[PDB]
Amino acid sequence: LAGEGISVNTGPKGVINDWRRFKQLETEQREEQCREMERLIKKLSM
Amino acid sequence: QVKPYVEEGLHPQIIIRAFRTATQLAVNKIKEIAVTVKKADKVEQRKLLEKCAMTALSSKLISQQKAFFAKMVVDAVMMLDDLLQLKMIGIKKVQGGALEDSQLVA
Amino acid sequence: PLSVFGDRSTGETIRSQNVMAAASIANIVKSSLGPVGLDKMLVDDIGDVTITNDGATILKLLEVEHPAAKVLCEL
Amino acid sequence: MMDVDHQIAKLMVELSKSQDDEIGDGTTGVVVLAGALLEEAEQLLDRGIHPIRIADGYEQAARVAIEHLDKISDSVL
Amino acid sequence: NSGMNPIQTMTEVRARQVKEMNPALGIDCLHKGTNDMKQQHVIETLIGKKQQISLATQMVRMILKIDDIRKP
Amino acid sequence: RLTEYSRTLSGMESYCVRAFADAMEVIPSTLAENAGLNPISTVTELRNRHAQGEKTAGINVRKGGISNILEELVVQPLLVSVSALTLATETVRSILKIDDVVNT
Amino acid sequence: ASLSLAPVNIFKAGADEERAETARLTSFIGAIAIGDLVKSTLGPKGMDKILLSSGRDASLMVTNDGATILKNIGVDNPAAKVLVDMSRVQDDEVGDGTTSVTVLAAELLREAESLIAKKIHPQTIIAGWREATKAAREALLSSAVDHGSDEVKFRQDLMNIAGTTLSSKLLTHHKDHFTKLAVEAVLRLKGSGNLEAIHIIKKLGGSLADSYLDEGFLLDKKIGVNQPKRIENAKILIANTGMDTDKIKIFGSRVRVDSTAKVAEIEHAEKEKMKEKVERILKHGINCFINRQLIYNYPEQLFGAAGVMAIEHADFAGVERLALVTGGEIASTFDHPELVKLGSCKLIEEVMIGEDKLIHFSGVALGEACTIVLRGATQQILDEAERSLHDALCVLAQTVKDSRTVYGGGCSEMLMAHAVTQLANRTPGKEAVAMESYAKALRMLPTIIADNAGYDSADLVAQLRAAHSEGNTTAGLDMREGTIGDMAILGITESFQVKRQVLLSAAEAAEVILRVDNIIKAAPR
Amino acid sequence: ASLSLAPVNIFKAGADEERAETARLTSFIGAIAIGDLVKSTLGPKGMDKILLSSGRDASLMVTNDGATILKNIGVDNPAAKVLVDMSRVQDDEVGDGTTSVTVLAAELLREAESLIAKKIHPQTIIAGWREATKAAREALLSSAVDHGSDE
Amino acid sequence: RGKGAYQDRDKPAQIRFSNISAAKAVADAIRTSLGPKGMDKMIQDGKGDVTITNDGATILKQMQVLHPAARMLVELSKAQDIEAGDGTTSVVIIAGSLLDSCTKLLQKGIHPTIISESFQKALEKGIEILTDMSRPVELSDRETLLNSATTSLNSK
Numbered sequence A: 001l002a003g004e005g006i007s008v009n010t011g012p013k014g015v016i017n018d019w020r021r022f023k024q025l026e027t028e029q030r031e032e033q034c035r036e037m038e039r040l041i042k043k044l045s046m
Numbered sequence B: 001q002v003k004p005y006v007e008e009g010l011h012p013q014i015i016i017r018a019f020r021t022a023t024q025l026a027v028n029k030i031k032e033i034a035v036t037v038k039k040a041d042k043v044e045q046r047k048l049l050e051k052c053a054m055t056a057l058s059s060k061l062i063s064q065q066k067a068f069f070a071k072m073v074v075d076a077v078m079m080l081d082d083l084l085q086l087k088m089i090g091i092k093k094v095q096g097g098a099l100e101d102s103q104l105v106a
Numbered sequence C: 001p002l003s004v005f006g007d008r009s010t011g012e013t014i015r016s017q018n019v020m021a022a023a024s025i026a027n028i029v030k031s032s033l034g035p036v037g038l039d040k041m042l043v044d045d046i047g048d049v050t051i052t053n054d055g056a057t058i059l060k061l062l063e064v065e066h067p068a069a070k071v072l073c074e075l
Numbered sequence D: 001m002m003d004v005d006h007q008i009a010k011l012m013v014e015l016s017k018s019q020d021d022e023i024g025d026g027t028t029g030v031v032v033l034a035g036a037l038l039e040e041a042e043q044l045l046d047r048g049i050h051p052i053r054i055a056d057g058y059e060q061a062a063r064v065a066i067e068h069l070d071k072i073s074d075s076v077l
Numbered sequence E: 001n002s003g004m005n006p007i008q009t010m011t012e013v014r015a016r017q018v019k020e021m022n023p024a025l026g027i028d029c030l031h032k033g034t035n036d037m038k039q040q041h042v043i044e045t046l047i048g049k050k051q052q053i054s055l056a057t058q059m060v061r062m063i064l065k066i067d068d069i070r071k072p
Numbered sequence F: 001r002l003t004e005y006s007r008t009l010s011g012m013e014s015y016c017v018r019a020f021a022d023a024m025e026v027i028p029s030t031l032a033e034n035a036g037l038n039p040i041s042t043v044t045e046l047r048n049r050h051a052q053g054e055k056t057a058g059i060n061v062r063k064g065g066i067s068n069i070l071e072e073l074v075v076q077p078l079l080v081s082v083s084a085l086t087l088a089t090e091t092v093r094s095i096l097k098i099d100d101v102v103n104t
Numbered sequence G: 001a002s003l004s005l006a007p008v009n010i011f012k013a014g015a016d017e018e019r020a021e022t023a024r025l026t027s028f029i030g031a032i033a034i035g036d037l038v039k040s041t042l043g044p045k046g047m048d049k050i051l052l053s054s055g056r057d058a059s060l061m062v063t064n065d066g067a068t069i070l071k072n073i074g075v076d077n078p079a080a081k082v083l084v085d086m087s088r089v090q091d092d093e094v095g096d097g098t099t100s101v102t103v104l105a106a107e108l109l110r111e112a113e114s115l116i117a118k119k120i121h122p123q124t125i126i127a128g129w130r131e132a133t134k135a136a137r138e139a140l141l142s143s144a145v146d147h148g149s150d151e152v153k154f155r156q157d158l159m160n161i162a163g164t165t166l167s168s169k170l171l172t173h174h175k176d177h178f179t180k181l182a183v184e185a186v187l188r189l190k191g192s193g194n195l196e197a198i199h200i201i202k203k204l205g206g207s208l209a210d211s212y213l214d215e216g217f218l219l220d221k222k223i224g225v226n227q228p229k230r231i232e233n234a235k236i237l238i239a240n241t242g243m244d245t246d247k248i249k250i251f252g253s254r255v256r257v258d259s260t261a262k263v264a265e266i267e268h269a270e271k272e273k274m275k276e277k278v279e280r281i282l283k284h285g286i287n288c289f290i291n292r293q294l295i296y297n298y299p300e301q302l303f304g305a306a307g308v309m310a311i312e313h314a315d316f317a318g319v320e321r322l323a324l325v326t327g328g329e330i331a332s333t334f335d336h337p338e339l340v341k342l343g344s345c346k347l348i349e350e351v352m353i354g355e356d357k358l359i360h361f362s363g364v365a366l367g368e369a370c371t372i373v374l375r376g377a378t379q380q381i382l383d384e385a386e387r388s389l390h391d392a393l394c395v396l397a398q399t400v401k402d403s404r405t406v407y408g409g410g411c412s413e414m415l416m417a418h419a420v421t422q423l424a425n426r427t428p429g430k431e432a433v434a435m436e437s438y439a440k441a442l443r444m445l446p447t448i449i450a451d452n453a454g455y456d457s458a459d460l461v462a463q464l465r466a467a468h469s470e471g472n473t474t475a476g477l478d479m480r481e482g483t484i485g486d487m488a489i490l491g492i493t494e495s496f497q498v499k500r501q502v503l504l505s506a507a508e509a510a511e512v513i514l515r516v517d518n519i520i521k522a523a524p525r
Numbered sequence H: 001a002s003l004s005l006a007p008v009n010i011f012k013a014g015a016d017e018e019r020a021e022t023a024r025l026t027s028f029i030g031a032i033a034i035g036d037l038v039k040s041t042l043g044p045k046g047m048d049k050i051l052l053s054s055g056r057d058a059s060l061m062v063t064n065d066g067a068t069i070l071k072n073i074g075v076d077n078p079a080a081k082v083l084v085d086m087s088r089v090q091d092d093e094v095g096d097g098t099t100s101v102t103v104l105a106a107e108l109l110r111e112a113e114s115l116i117a118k119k120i121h122p123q124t125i126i127a128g129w130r131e132a133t134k135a136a137r138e139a140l141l142s143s144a145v146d147h148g149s150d151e
Numbered sequence I: 001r002g003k004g005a006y007q008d009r010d011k012p013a014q015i016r017f018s019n020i021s022a023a024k025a026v027a028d029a030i031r032t033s034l035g036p037k038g039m040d041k042m043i044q045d046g047k048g049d050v051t052i053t054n055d056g057a058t059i060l061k062q063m064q065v066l067h068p069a070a071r072m073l074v075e076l077s078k079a080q081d082i083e084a085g086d087g088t089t090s091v092v093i094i095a096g097s098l099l100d101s102c103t104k105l106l107q108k109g110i111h112p113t114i115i116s117e118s119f120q121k122a123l124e125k126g127i128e129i130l131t132d133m134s135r136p137v138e139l140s141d142r143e144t145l146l147n148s149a150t151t152s153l154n155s156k
């Protein structure tokens, strides 16, 4: 098992659309999480 | 074609009656102007069947070989006795080979 | 091959879609024309009620998504 | 043995299998020939030709080529 | 596949076939020094070539005739 | 004219110049399309007319055919076609001098 | 007993450790991967790369420069980091040679991997490589030729060096035009080495051959509202004063009165102070006034009323380049007009370059500052043209500083390797094997040059080896058609500094990577 | 246009293909890894391996046989599978040489990797190797000595 | 002289084919927006903004294209917009067609450097031909300027 420096190169240039589409929803849920975390445990911890 | 008339609140019964009248007249006209030959000639009947089969086949992927298949189909049908049962015309499909390689077995 | 991040509609599909949108906007207000036309009642999902017959008011109060429908609304 | 999902790839697989069944040799030539034919048909379509007309022209040329093959053939014992 | 330049070799062989009427001139894949497949003893069945051309043409037509796809 | 020019060259260079000319032949085909005309026959007729010497023959969408277009008042400045040709060739050469893609 | 392979655990979570064979394997794999990536972009027939960024902006670069390829990639192999830093330092020290040094280091490390597989202690390899580097450096130094005294010969050598530098890059399409342009630009510096004095302006649109070196200077600033747009026999004054609500620097000062009349009087006093300052500036008898900082509305009015072109907000680079090109003095006080030297040029006017307007300084006095206008069809083309021109200008400036030149095209590398082989077959032990591997890498460099062009690299390199061993010390790869030729006649020339730096840096990096027998990684954050 | 590097996707989910560079790279890595595994157990001074089964019983096995080592490993590299099958067949045909054949194949493939890197068509390598194998086999046969007559 | 150098990489060919495919796809996208009978396109960005346009540069800029070759074509259209002012659709179509021809050229075994030099030669000859076809014009002739403006507007 060699060639650990794969340098995936062209791979994510043709599969970019799927990665971006899923990352958009991931970031949407991340922004929802960043909006609701401060509601959670932030005062309940005290 | 009748959608705009429906849109402006035309009663459906009138449209239905109009369709029925037009259909009756059209069917009568078709029966009146249709061409038939009262000779029952074998050669002419065979030619008529072949032409009808060619017109029927001249829209499929075998249209380039429509004369060959039309002749085969007409022969197969004329080889049937009196009921023209479909189950007496077997169809066997064998992979590989050109379309012209297909054959009718008497 | 194009690889654009979005959706593409070409040809008869988008034209029929635009006509559908415009016709829907028309039918929204088509029942309120002329002396035998009747008014409409609108609710702003909070409880506000607006009884109106004016076409501009009806189309302004509605929230619309399609672009051709928007074109007719601003028209 | 290729694990394809595209339907046209399945058509190519079936074409090669048909050539194998009927003849037993030349199962790679048919696929390459079909690919070349479609590749030329692509630039033919880009110039505005109905694909049925392209298929008709291909059939006519195939008839010409088959007749030529019969002409230049050689017999063996 | 044999490493030679495709277009140059193909054009040269075609020109030779036209000039001297020898339909046996092909691509000297094994580098034997001659293009004459009749001399090189490269032989193929006529049925094989005819089937290749026929099947390829029919399948190309069948693919060209398809203009709609309705995958689930 | 570029087909004629390529007929005077030799080697792979002639094939490349012929391909260049064939690629240039695409704008008249696109104009013949989009207007309901038969693109193949329209381009063929344009090419024949220009070979016969009518440098000003072009696609006429008003009469649905091919005729002199100076009588149709369809003219454009030279530094539109010249600029498009030069910039397109430069971009094509730049893309051709590329053989790998690396993601940072 | 190793740290990782011991019954007790001595590490935090995520911290690991790689012993001898594993560390050497990872180092050699990473280095060889870096070298293989950066090569194929080497020599006159090397191709470019597309650097598609993964960030939100997703920057796109089309480059042939080895250093930009190496620095703009996510690298996590530590040995690859060593090579990347080597390439960056090579770019800092001299212009070209980034790809050559990276490829040479990679080849040396591959040979070292083979040698260690042949059961040779890495210290023996290092000793042999030190001897080989000494021999190669001596041979190259003895191979150099200096044409600094002969003016016409030195200019010819400069042209050849610029052409060789630009041969690999995208500008090879118009190599002649761009070589002449770069040589003229460097010669206009009159011996000064500051490449910052050469401003490269990238203007989209137009062909790449439309690029030109301006006979004067071009500034991308704006003239005031009521000021002349065309001045002849301009007497420029370059300054770095405030000229915008110029407050007295006593920061504890405040205005405190008991009536608005006094506040009005004080603001009139402030305006009068600004007017007096503008009068002092005009006392120099100037036509154009170029300021580094902003110029507010009142001084702008005052200059307009006096018919003075007041260019405002030219950054430090702008005023420095204007001082270089026109001979003026960057002044901040105006109490002694007679001690300040003014710039001078025949004509100042506004020109169009595409859809933009730029100020043109024509017929400048000194001219020790150049502006190169770059035209292209894409932003990537413009960026790569700028990078290629920077490579050429850097190499030319180095050559002007140090005029020693060596022949490129594999001649210098292969004479180095011949000297290394001569020393190698004269020493006993396995150091001879290490030295032969050193020479093998040196041969591998022009071998890659020939491979990139699709030539018969084995035969060409064998011919070159025979020619160099038989005494023909100027033979090299002729890439016009794929034979060997005389670099003296074909005019393929390189800067001696570039090749010496490439050799020494590659040897150093291969040595520092080879000495490693263990890679210990801390827990990542 | 490669099968996998095309805008349309022609495979199921899980199928993949490796073109020239990648196929040769994986084949050579697998072959060289297998050869380096089996070697160091070669000759009079070779050492033995330990094969720890991962099953419920976890059977232990110390061994020096090349075929035994290659059999009881889960190789996913298909070229490694080819070499493992070669060693097993060698064991079936004759008792010894299960390590030598694997080492020779790995060394040949390493040299082939170098030759491919030197821009040599693999068919040229195959032709040269066929000629070399013929010559080597003839020489080895000519060197053979027989003593069956003398008890 | 034997077989020749063995192309053992095949990834450069894949990259060239991918770039050509992207450029040809972009041209095919903007093929129906050409000529007096062309038609506009509706582009809706990430926000709710809606654009109806026939301008090739605006169409290319308004839709993010995600492929390096398509991005270079976008910059090409912008450059043509800067210098010439219009004809931004034609330049993209020409570039796409040229690369499409490069496909078949590269399949025939022509190095993508002989193609580039041959394209440069063809460009020089084409510039000569276009200049030969030209007709001198002076700005005092209002009729020709009106015709040029009308021709420019015919497609909008």
Ligand SMILES: Nc1ncnc2c1ncn2[C@@H]1O[C@H](COP(=O)(O)OP(=O)(O)O)[C@@H](O)[C@H]1O
Binding pocket: G041, G042, G043, G044, G046, G066, G096, G097, G098, G099, G100, G163, G164, G165, G166, G167, G168, G169, G408, G409, G410, G449, G477, G478, G479, G492, G494
């Ligand atoms: N016309 C030419 N003929 C032969 N060799 C050349 C020519 N031009 C450049 N080279 C060689 O190509 C090598 C690589 O140069 P280049 O790619 O421009 O920069 P770098 O050295 O950073 O890779 C140089 O060592 C030079 O000797």
Ligand SMILES: Nc1ncnc2c1ncn2[C@@H]1O[C@H](COP(=O)(O)OP(=O)(O)O)[C@@H](O)[C@H]1O
Binding pocket: H041, H042, H043, H044, H046, H066, H096, H097, H098, H099, H100, H101
């Ligand atoms: N006493 C010995 N002296 C020298 N070589 C030996 C001796 N015994 C065995 N060998 C060599 O060791 C080689 C490998 O044998 P071995 O290690 O058993 O693995 P295998 O026989 O499975 O390849 C043989 O080629 C043989 O020539």
Ligand SMILES: Nc1ncnc2c1ncn2[C@@H]1O[C@H](COP(=O)(O)OP(=O)(O)O)[C@@H](O)[C@H]1O
Binding pocket: F031, F059, F060, F061, F074, F076, I033, I034, I035, I036, I038, I056, I086, I087, I088, I089, I090, I091, I151, I152, I154, I155, I156
């Ligand atoms: N009235 C017309 N008749 C025929 N061709 C026309 C006419 N008007 C414009 N054209 C052609 O249409 C082509 C495309 O122009 P247009 O659609 O405006 O986009 P662009 O100018 O950006 O290419 C031009 O090359 C021009 O020759």
Ligand SMILES: [Mg+2]
Binding pocket: D025, D026, D027
């Ligand atoms: Mg066969």
Ligand SMILES: [Mg+2]
Binding pocket: G096, G097, G164, G165, G166, G168, G391
């Ligand atoms: Mg360089």
Ligand SMILES: [Mg+2]
Binding pocket: H096, H097
């Ligand atoms: Mg044994």
Ligand SMILES: [Mg+2]
Binding pocket: I086, I087, I152, I155
């Ligand atoms: Mg226009």
